Design a protein around this motif. Structure first.
Motif, PDB file in Angstrom:
ATOM      1  N   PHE A 169       0.824  -1.203   0.000  1.00 17.73           N
ATOM      2  CA  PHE A 169       0.000   0.000   0.000  1.00 17.73           C
ATOM      3  C   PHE A 169       0.860   1.255   0.000  1.00 17.73           C
ATOM      4  N   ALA A 170       2.176   1.091   0.157  1.00 18.30           N
ATOM      5  CA  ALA A 170       3.078   2.235   0.103  1.00 18.30           C
ATOM      6  C   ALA A 170       3.950   2.190  -1.143  1.00 18.30           C
ATOM      7  N   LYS A 171       3.838   1.121  -1.932  1.00 12.31           N
ATOM      8  CA  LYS A 171       4.610   1.045  -3.167  1.00 12.31           C
ATOM      9  C   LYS A 171       3.770   1.452  -4.370  1.00 12.31           C
ATOM     10  N   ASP A 172       2.488   1.083  -4.380  1.00 10.64           N
ATOM     11  CA  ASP A 172       1.604   1.526  -5.452  1.00 10.64           C
ATOM     12  C   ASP A 172       1.561   3.044  -5.516  1.00 10.64           C
ATOM     13  N   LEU A 173       1.296   3.685  -4.385  1.00 11.63           N
ATOM     14  CA  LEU A 173       1.535   5.109  -4.266  1.00 11.63           C
ATOM     15  C   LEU A 173       3.030   5.362  -4.092  1.00 11.63           C
ATOM     16  N   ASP A 174       3.445   6.587  -4.382  1.00 13.08           N
ATOM     17  CA  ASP A 174       4.846   6.978  -4.274  1.00 13.08           C
ATOM     18  C   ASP A 174       5.077   7.576  -2.890  1.00 13.08           C
ATOM     19  N   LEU A 175       5.403   6.721  -1.923  1.00 19.16           N
ATOM     20  CA  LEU A 175       5.595   7.137  -0.540  1.00 19.16           C
ATOM     21  C   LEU A 175       6.971   6.830   0.027  1.00 19.16           C
ATOM     22  N   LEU A 176       7.518   5.644  -0.216  1.00 24.70           N
ATOM     23  CA  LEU A 176       8.794   5.284   0.385  1.00 24.70           C
ATOM     24  C   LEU A 176       9.920   6.138  -0.185  1.00 24.70           C
ATOM     25  N   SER A 177      10.829   6.556   0.694  1.00 28.56           N
ATOM     26  CA  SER A 177      11.939   7.405   0.284  1.00 28.56           C
ATOM     27  C   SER A 177      12.834   6.671  -0.704  1.00 28.56           C
ATOM     28  N   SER A 178      13.157   7.338  -1.808  1.00 30.19           N
ATOM     29  CA  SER A 178      14.045   6.790  -2.821  1.00 30.19           C
ATOM     30  C   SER A 178      15.369   7.533  -2.905  1.00 30.19           C
ATOM     31  N   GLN A 179      15.654   8.422  -1.952  1.00 33.16           N
ATOM     32  CA  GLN A 179      16.861   9.236  -2.036  1.00 33.16           C
ATOM     33  C   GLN A 179      18.120   8.383  -1.953  1.00 33.16           C
ATOM     34  N   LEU A 180      18.157   7.426  -1.024  1.00 36.99           N
ATOM     35  CA  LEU A 180      19.371   6.640  -0.832  1.00 36.99           C
ATOM     36  C   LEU A 180      19.556   5.615  -1.942  1.00 36.99           C
TER      37      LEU A 180
END
Ligand SMILES: [Ca+2]
Ligand SMILES: [Zn+2]
Lengths: 168, 410, 349, 121, 183, 279, 80
Positions: free
Chosen positions: A28-39
């Motif tokens: 439910f947090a991958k379908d939407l763009d929620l998890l930090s991708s900076q690292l």
């Protein structure tokens, strides 16, 4: 000091390496763009390697100056649950160790101490009086004010014991 | 008598299959203290929102306790105090100036709109939770809306106006000769300790941070007076207590109490303040180290009531209250949040975990041995031996509540 | 001896003096005749007079009188000694998650409190369109609109409709709902749409900010570490630390009579491969460093390998492969003694 | 009767209440050193206004004209060496005004006159 | 000028303790005390009347006892009460009106409140305009009273813990009584 | 350059008022979007002190003169709920008004009072004078407080002794860097285990050790504090003690004689002994 | 930065006027001088910012302050 800081990482290395790989994104947090991708873009997430060997090749980049300090630290915060905070000054403690090691070649008084030590450490058979001979010669090179130390090594048990001496 | 031992994973006990009763009044989320106030009654709503999505409503029984009357609120609080609560509103603060100083209301504990209604939701929620245990209808009662343990007889302290726990315990006391109260909020539960200090029918075991931390009471030597001597038990912990050390203290002490002073019921106040990261409390407890406290007390097998109490970071307390509700229902929840209305809160990994901090644990094993030794010295003396009563009306809320909480949005 | 202090209280106080000397304290306990095996009031609570306990409670049963406490009371202003309390300090970043938390609640409180009115009015409004127009004339709503909470629907209407003006809305809502409820519902939905459209825009601001400063908030010791290390890792404290252990073993000698032992400080080295790890770290820094002159840096590199290979019994050749492999990741060797390294003159040969 | 009010409503003062409202020989005669302080200053050119308290004074002024300004460490100096001089001129003019009024000690009357006469009001 | 009153040290040490209980320990004296200002002077006037023979001094004694009572009634409201005790004084006035009997302080308040009046007597004397021969008349007469009070200090001023005896001259203050009085 | 609600109850309601929704909510305006999202986005006459107490509170102000009184202080006390109607005067101003405009020379007014009550004559002037002064808070005269060196008047008129610790500067409590908190030394300060002036280590009395631990392992360190009278260092473990107690009052170390003893007679149940105050 | 004009101390003004030539400085100056210095900067800055705000820059550089001072008539030397 470096050894104590490094070792406690390698002891966690087996538990942490498994933990970093097995963590999974919530659907439910991958379908939407929620998890930090900076690292992940910067590559400072220990997804592809064992944690400890990766911590070294990140530190090697810190001294090299390639990696900013605040990005090196943040990568160990997410990787080790804040547990490995001691590896924030691995660039400076390495520097101070080199600086102190430089004093050994210079300061010809101090170098003469390890001039005697190398001969003693190479000696297989040392009489009880020989140690006293070794001690008294070393005392000659220090000023009568300085307080010499005794670092003692046990080869079988890799045990190093330091004694604090302020004798005559 | 303090043996440091590493933490162990929370394991569910198949021997106990308790039939829980959950008390949620849908309105309790809509009351707000102030512009920057720490107490936020929203946390009940999210902690309930998470619960419904795990499908815990399949095991629990959802109830809506009838709000406490004005008279029943007075069986602990003096008639002057309750009468002040009913009329007081933000517009009426000018009319009441002597009272607002006499009754510590409206300055740190603000007079927000709906002050009486919210307090009326808390008490009927804990009081009836005791009433259902007495009838034998449920072995557990869960009233997260209540738990306000800081209020006094004629004073509102520590964000708590109506002290429901005293109202809850007095309801249990009408059937059970002895009741045990266990406090795990970082503050000292002075509201309940000062109420039951004299009687021996209630033991108030409270874990808190001493050292001029609010309310600055609960020193180790406070063991009650009169008949209730040794029947009070305060454990003054220092800063930075963590998961493994807390268990090594909580479990040995509780095991001693339920042996020497055999309680017929337990009122366990699951404080959220002890968790790491809260704005007012300073401990390092993580969820697993905090929810383990509930699982231990449950394992004994005697009827208990779980009250919410204080929790000041909505993200952390809503997660641990949902996990604790899992343990009571003999189900260990998965570390993956389900979609819920308040989903953007639980950053950043969006998992059900409260991550312990890095702060330095200062309680020392030499100190903890001296605290636990004195307590055991004392506890060897505590050998065992429009009114509505037994308010029972409950309302059967779930038919109305199922569409709330349970989300198929996409 | 003045009969002011009881014998048991005397022995308890002497314990703090002569506690360690068990052979002496036992003799003192024997001498005075102390035999081992209420007034334990506690510091927190003070007794009230009898008169003040009479302030009435309407619904206290006979049972409540025996159980509850009325005489003994304790308050913060007394336990604090009037000097106040110390709150726990919080980070610079942990106070950002608190600002964000409030901004989260402020939007969430107003929206959700608004929804609970929408459903309350929505069930009402459909009722009017069922009723006859004549009937519509007389369908007043008791307070609370029949809902469970009398207070919620006031704090929401008062917010939207201009404070004071809002009061005659509620009176109009009760007295004449048939023409008021449809209008109020319309606007409340309209104010709902505006509020939600803001939250979504505010959701991105809150989510990324929490991402930048979350893992720092947990990190209490990491933030203050960089400054603490250079303070506590110095030639002074490393000698104060080791000397502190020496004095303890000799102090007790004065009192506990501990024998004077060797090895105040003990270290242990269980894992070998850390040494090749530290060497390759200091190898990188030495080459990169600009301070040390290039000819001298060869001694700094060659000091660490030889000193380690000498002190810790590790063979030198094993070390050289470890550095060599780390060089790979990125012509003759006579016997260079550490003794040779320590003197520049022999080094050139 | 008119009763002011109380600002704060609690007896504890919130110091003991959490989420507090209030808890989160030889001597020189007079004048002889003055002259010695002048010749020790009129001979020197070093900056008199303390620097880091000036830096924070310029920033505070810049805000209500524009937000998030960044001053070059040179342009904080160039302000200081100006506003120091402005004042030293003003004080010479006021000293003249006071010597005129026949007293020695400058006073705000003198400041306001030495500004009005300059027309820089 | 400046008038000096020699208070014996023991009585001078009581007051300080009274200053500690009411401002630091925040406890007030049970107002309807057992030895009130009235019988304290009743006993002293009665013990000393037989002691002295000359009828001239008996007039001097009796008026100093009669006077000190009348002055105490007027004085207690104004400057013999610490701030924390003002509310307790008020409830007595508020009780008096309901009981329909006017409050008479000498009947209520204890001997310690009489000592408070004696302590500020030199300051009150200096403020007014009095004959000098009457200044030494009061001070000498008062110094004779304080000496008598010293001989009986034991059974007027007893140090009993309020938590314990409950017969102690001082009783603690509830968190609600303290709030209004100080707030 | 200028030149350049009410509704017929039968009918529909006129819309109440266009909502002026400028709330200045903690977020900038409830309806407004975030503004510029620069950070937080990764990519882009009467006195104010009571004349009696000399402290603050709700006041009742004299009309004639600039003197304010608490509601409790003025004699007799006046209810905040019910007040005398119209103007109010302090008992001093009432006196002057009383005297003035009637039998004005005070003498004659006072000369009648002394003649009125000849029995109390020795106290006559003192009784008459007490009708003129305003209510006051009792403060011990200086010749009493000066007898005991230890006692001293606090900021509020409190009794403050040698036991009360001198207050911490408000800066020290709230203005510290994060790493070091002065109020609680719960962050591994190793300079606690050192005597500042002499440079030797502080040694606990119970265990005769100092437990200064390595920077490598700080959990070996045990907290040490020093008495406020004795100056004998103690571990926070040896005297079981939860914290440092640097706010309330000076910490009396164990090992210091009692100043107050409650003795049970074993047959009143108890006898009390208090050490004589220092003269 | 709530109150920084209180940062320009009493010895700060006293030191300045000592350079000016005064001998005895009356107490009310130390406050009143701050009133002058403030209203001086509010004019020099409000001009220096405008030159900056025009060039689109975000930094008030010395070459600006020298310009803002020049219109004041108080020409400045040494910076540009
Ligand atoms: Ca009890
Ligand atoms: Zn709490």
């Amino acid at each position: 000091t470096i050894y104590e800081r490094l070792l406690e990482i390698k002891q966690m290395n087996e538990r942490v390496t498994k933990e970093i790989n097995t963590r999974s994104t919530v659907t439910f947090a991958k379908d939407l763009d929620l998890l930090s991708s900076q690292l992940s873009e910067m590559g400072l997430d220990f997804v592809g390697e064992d944690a400890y060997k990766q911590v070294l090749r990140l530190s090697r980049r810190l001294i090299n100056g390639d990696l900013e300090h605040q990005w090196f630290e943040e990568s160990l915060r997410q990787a080790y649950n804040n547990k490995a905070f001691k590896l924030y000054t691995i660039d400076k403690v390495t520097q101070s160790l080199v600086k102190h090691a430089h004093t050994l070649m210079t300061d010809a008084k101090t170098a003469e101490i390890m001039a005697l030590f190398v001969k003693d450490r190479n000696a297989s058979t040392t009489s009880a009086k020989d140690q006293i001979i070794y001690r008294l010669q070393v005392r000659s090179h220090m000023s009568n004010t300085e307080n010499m130390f005794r670092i003692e090594f046990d080869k079988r048990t890799l045990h190093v014991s330091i004694q604090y001496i302020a004798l005559d | 008598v303090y043996e440091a031992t590493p933490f162990d994973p929370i394991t569910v006990k198949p021997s106990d299959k308790r039939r829980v009763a959950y008390f949620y009044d849908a309105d309790v989320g809509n009351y707000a203290y102030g512009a920057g106030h720490p107490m936020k009654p929203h946390r009940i709503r999210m902690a309930h929102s998470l619960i419904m999505n795990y499908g815990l409503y399949k095991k629990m029984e959802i109830y809506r306790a009838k709000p406490a009357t004005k008279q029943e609120m007075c069986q602990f609080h003096t008639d002057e105090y309750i009468d002040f609560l009913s009329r007081v509103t933000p517009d009426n603060l000018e009319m009441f100036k002597r009272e607002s100083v006499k009754f510590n209301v409206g300055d740190d504990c603000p007079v927000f709109d709906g002050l009486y209604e919210y307090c009326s939701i808390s008490g009927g929620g804990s009081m009836e939770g005791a009433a259902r245990l007495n009838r034998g209808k449920c072995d557990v009662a869960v009233n997260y809306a209540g738990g306000l343990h800081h209020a006094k007889k004629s004073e509102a302290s520590g964000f708590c106006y109506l002290n429901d726990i005293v109202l809850g315990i007095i309801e249990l006391l009408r059937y059970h000769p002895r009741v045990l109260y266990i406090d795990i909020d970082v503050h000292h539960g002075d509201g309940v300790e000062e109420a039951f200090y004299t009687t021996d029918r209630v033991m108030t075991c409270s874990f808190h941070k001493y050292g001029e931390f609010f309310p600055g009471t609960g020193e180790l030597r406070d063991i009650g007076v009169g008949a209730g001597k040794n029947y009070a038990v305060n454990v003054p912990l220092r800063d930075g207590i963590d998961d493994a050390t807390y268990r090594s203290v909580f479990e040995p002490v509780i095991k001693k109490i339920m042996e020497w002073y055999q309680p017929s019921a337990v009122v366990l106040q699951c404080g959220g303040d002890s968790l790491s990261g809260d704005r007012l409390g300073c401990f390092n407890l993580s969820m697993e180290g905090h929810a383990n406290c509930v699982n231990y007390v449950k394992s004994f097998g005697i009827p208990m009531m779980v009250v919410g109490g204080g929790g000041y970071t909505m993200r952390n307390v809503a997660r641990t209250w949902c996990f604790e509700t899992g343990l009571l229902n003999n189900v260990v929840l998965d570390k993956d949040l389900p979609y819920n209305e308040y989903y953007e809160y639980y950053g950043p990994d969006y998992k059900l975990s409260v991550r312990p901090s890095n702060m330095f644990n200062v309680n020392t094993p030499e100190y903890l041995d001296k605290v636990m030794t004195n307590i055991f010295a004392n506890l060897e003396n505590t050998k065992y031996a429009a009114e509505d009563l037994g308010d029972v009306e409950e309302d059967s809320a779930e038919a109305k509540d199922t569409k709330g909480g349970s989300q198929y949005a996409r | 001896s003045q009969d002011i202090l009881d014998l048991d209280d005397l022995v308890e106080k002497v314990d703090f003096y002569l506690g360690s000397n068990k052979e002496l304290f036992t003799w003192f306990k024997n001498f005075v005749g102390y035999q081992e095996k209420c007034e334990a009031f506690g510091p927190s609570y003070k007794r009230l007079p009898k008169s003040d306990t009479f302030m009435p409670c309407s619904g206290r049963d006979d049972m409540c009188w025996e159980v509850l406490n009325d005489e003994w009371v304790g308050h913060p202003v007394w336990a604090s000694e009037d000097s106040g309390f110390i709150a726990h300090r919080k980070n610079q970043y942990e106070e950002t998650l608190f600002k964000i938390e409030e901004e989260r609640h402020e939007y969430d409180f107003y929206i959700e409190s608004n929804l609970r009115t929408i459903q309350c009015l929505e069930t009402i409004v459909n009722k009017i369109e069922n009723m006859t127009e004549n009937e519509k004339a007389n369908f007043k709503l008791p307070p609370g609109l029949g809902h469970t909470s009398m207070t919620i629907y006031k704090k929401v209407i008062r917010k939207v409709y201009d404070k004071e003006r809002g009061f005659e809305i509620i009176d109009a809502l009760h007295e004449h709902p048939a023409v008021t409820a449809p209008v109020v519902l319309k606007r409340l939905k309209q104010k709902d749409e505006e509020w939600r459209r803001a939250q979504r825009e505010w959701n991105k601001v809150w989510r990324e900010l929490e991402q930048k400063v979350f893992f720092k908030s947990l990190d209490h010791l990491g933030l203050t570490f960089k400054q603490a290390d250079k303070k506590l890792l110095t030639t002074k404290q490393l000698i104060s630390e080791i000397s502190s252990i020496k004095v303890d073993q000799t102090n007790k000698k004065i009192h506990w009579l501990t024998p004077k032992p060797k090895s105040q400080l003990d270290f242990d080295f269980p894992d070998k491969n850390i040494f090749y790890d530290i060497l390759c770290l200091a190898d990188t820094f030495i080459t990169h460093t600009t301070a040390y002159s290039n000819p001298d840096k060869e001694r700094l590199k060659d000091l660490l390998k030889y000193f380690i290979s000498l002190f810790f019994s590790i063979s030198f050749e094993k070390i050289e492969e470890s550095l060599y492999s780390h060089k790979q990741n990125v012509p003759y060797q006579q016997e260079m003694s550490l003794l040779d390294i320590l003197h520049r003159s022999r080094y050139q040969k | 009767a008119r009763t002011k009010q109380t600002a704060r409503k609690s007896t504890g003062g919130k110091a003991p209440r959490k989420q507090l409202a209030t808890k989160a020989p030889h001597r020189y005669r007079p004048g002889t050193v003055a002259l010695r302080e002048i010749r020790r200053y009129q001979k020197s050119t070093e900056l008199l206004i303390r620097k880091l308290p000036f830096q924070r004074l310029v920033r505070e002024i810049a805000q209500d004209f524009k937000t998030d300004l960044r001053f070059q460490s040179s342009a904080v100096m160039a302000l200081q060496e100006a506003s120091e001089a402005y004042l030293v001129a003003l004080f010479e003019d006021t000293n003249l005004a006071a010597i005129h009024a026949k007293r020695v000690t400058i006073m705000p009357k003198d400041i306001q006159l030495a500004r009005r006469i300059r027309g820089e009001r | 000028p400046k008038i000096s009153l020699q208070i014996p040290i023991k009585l001078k040490s009581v007051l300080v303790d009274d200053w500690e209980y009411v401002t630091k320990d925040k406890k007030i004296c049970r107002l309807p005390a057992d030895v009130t200002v009235e019988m304290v002077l009743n006993k002293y006037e009665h013990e000393v009347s037989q002691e002295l023979e000359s009828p001239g001094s008996q007039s001097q004694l009796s008026e100093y006892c009669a006077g000190l009572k009348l002055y105490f009634d007027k004085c207690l409201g104004n400057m013999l009460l610490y701030r924390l005790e003002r509310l307790q004084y008020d409830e007595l006035l508020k009780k008096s009106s309901k009981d329909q009997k006017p409050l008479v302080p000498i009947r209520i308040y204890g001997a310690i409140h009489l000592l408070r009046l004696i302590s500020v007597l030199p300051e009150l004397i200096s403020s007014t305009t009095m004959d000098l021969q009457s200044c030494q008349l009061l001070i000498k007469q008062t110094e004779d009273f304080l000496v008598w009070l010293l001989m009986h200090v034991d059974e007027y001023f007893n140090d009993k813990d309020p938590n314990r005896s409950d017969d102690a001259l001082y009783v603690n203050t509830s968190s609600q009584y303290e709030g209004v009085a100080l707030g | 350059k200028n030149e350049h609600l009410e509704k017929d109850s039968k009918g529909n309601i006129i819309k109440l008022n266009e909502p002026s929704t400028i709330s200045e909510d903690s977020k900038v305006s409830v309806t407004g979007l975030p503004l510029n999202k620069g950070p937080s986005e990764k990519i882009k006459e009467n006195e104010d002190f009571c004349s009696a107490c000399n402290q603050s509170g709700s006041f009742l102000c004299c009309d004639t003169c600039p003197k304010s009184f608490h509601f409790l202080c003025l004699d007799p006390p006046i209810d905040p709920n019910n007040l005398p109607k119209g103007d109010w005067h302090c008992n001093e101003c009432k006196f002057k008004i009383f005297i003035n405009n009637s039998m004005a020379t005070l003498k004659k007014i006072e000369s009648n009072f002394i003649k009125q009550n000849n029995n109390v004559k020795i106290f006559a002037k003192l009784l008459f004078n007490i009708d003129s002064h305003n209510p006051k808070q009792f403060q011990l005269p200086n010749y009493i407080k000066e007898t005991f060196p230890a006692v001293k008047t606090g900021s509020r008129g409190q009794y403050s002794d040698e036991n009360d610790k001198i207050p911490l500067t408000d800066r020290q409590l709230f203005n510290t860097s994060y790493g070091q908190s002065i109020t609680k030394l719960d962050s591994y300060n190793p300079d606690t285990h050192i005597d500042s002036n002499s440079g030797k280590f502080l040694i606990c009395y119970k265990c005769n050790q100092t437990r200064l631990g390595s920077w490598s392992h700080p959990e070996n360190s045990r907290l040490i504090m020093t008495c406020d009278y004795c100056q004998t260092p103690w571990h926070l473990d040896c005297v079981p003690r939860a914290s440092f107690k640097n706010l309330g009052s000076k910490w009396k170390c164990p090992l210091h004689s009692p100043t107050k003893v409650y003795k049970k007679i074993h047959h009143v149940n108890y006898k009390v002994w208090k050490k004589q105050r220092l003269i | 930065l709530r109150d920084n004009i209180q940062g320009i101390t009493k010895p700060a003004i006293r030191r300045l006027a000592r350079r000016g030539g005064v001998k005895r400085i009356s107490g009310l100056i130390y406050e009143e001088t701050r009133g002058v210095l403030k209203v001086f900067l509010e004019n020099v800055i409000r001009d220096a910012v405008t030159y900056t705000e025009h060039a689109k820059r975000k930094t008030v550089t010395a070459m600006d302050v020298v310009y803002a001072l020049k219109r004041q008539g108080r020409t400045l030397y040494g910076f540009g």
